[PDB]
Amino acid sequence: SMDEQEALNSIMNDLVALQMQSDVRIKFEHNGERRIIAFSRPVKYEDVEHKVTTVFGQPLDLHYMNNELSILLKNQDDLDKAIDILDRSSSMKSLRILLLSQD
Amino acid sequence: ASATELLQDYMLTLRTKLSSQEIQQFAALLHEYRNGASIHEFCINLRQLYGDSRKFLLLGLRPFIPEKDSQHFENFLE
């Protein structure tokens, strides 16, 4: 429930703002299909996109899933930040990424 | 603000009807929308994640959507 409370708190603060190896393991989530793929450091963003396209056969958006640290990964920088977050966490063992289609 | 209760009832609905994972997933999308994402974008993401069984979630979210985006969110209903 730890992850749950932390989510519900995130949702609350968001709505209340209505108007005022050392390989990186990425857990991919696409229509209930978990897929864990490891990436060696240094992890390149375009290679991750490349991997998604191959494995899942269609262009998918990467939604980094971490309550108020969640973000649409659009660039090397975004990814490195997610990777850093995971490095400094005591509980997380993988980067969680929800896959959605842009259209 | 008189709508503090209307937030708690919505939080209550989420806590009581959504699985733990569906909450983390939703929190994540909701954070993107909060942080500058379009409404059209947000809706597309919701539609891929929440089918018929999760109408209440979408509905209960409506009054929390600002007027200008609200126009698009309502038609987004089935």
Residue numbers in the entry:
A (entry chain B): 0 to 19, 42 to 124
B (entry chain A): 293 to 370
Publication excerpt:
MEKK3 (MAP3K3) is a highly conserved protein kinase essential for embryonic angiogenesis in mice. MEKK3 interacts physically with CCM2 but how this interaction is mediated, and its relevance to cerebral vasculature, are not known. MEKK3 contains only two defined domains: an N-terminal Phox/Bem1p (PB1) domain and a C-terminal catalytic domain. We find a direct interaction between the harmonin homology domain (HHD) of CCM2 and the N-terminal region of MEKK3 encompassing both an N-terminal helix and the Phox/Bem1p (PB1) domain, and determine a 2.35-Å cocrystal structure of the complex.
To better understand how CCM2 and MEKK3 interact we determined a cocrystal structure of MEKK3NPB1 with CCM2HHD to 2.35 Å resolution. This difference density corresponded to an additional helix, which, after further rounds of refinement, we identified and built as the N-terminal 19 residues of MEKK3. The overall structure of the CCM2HHD:MEKK3NPB1 complex reveals an extensive interface between the two proteins. MEKK3 resembles a hand, with the N-terminal helix forming the thumb and the PB1 domain forming the palm/fingers. MEKK3 grasps the CCM2HHD, with the thumb (MEKK3N) resting in the groove between CCM2 helices H1 and H2, and the palm/fingers (MEKK3PB1) holding CCM2 helices H2 and H3. The N-terminal helix (αN) of MEKK3 fits snugly into the hydrophobic groove between CCM2 helices H1/H4 and H2, making extensive interactions with them. We found that mutants in MEKK3 helix αN (A6D/L7D, D13R, I10D/L14D) severely interrupted CCM2 pull down, but mutation within the MEKK3 PB1 domain (L119E/L121E) only moderately reduced CCM2HHD pull down. Isothermal titration calorimetry showed an observed Kd of 1.4±0.4 μM for the wild-type (WT) components, but no heat of interaction was observed for CCM2HHD (A319D/A320D), MEKK3NPB1 (A6D/L7D) or MEKK3NPB1 (D13R) mutants tested. We therefore conclude that the interaction between CCM2 and MEKK3 is important for correct subcellular localization of CCM2.
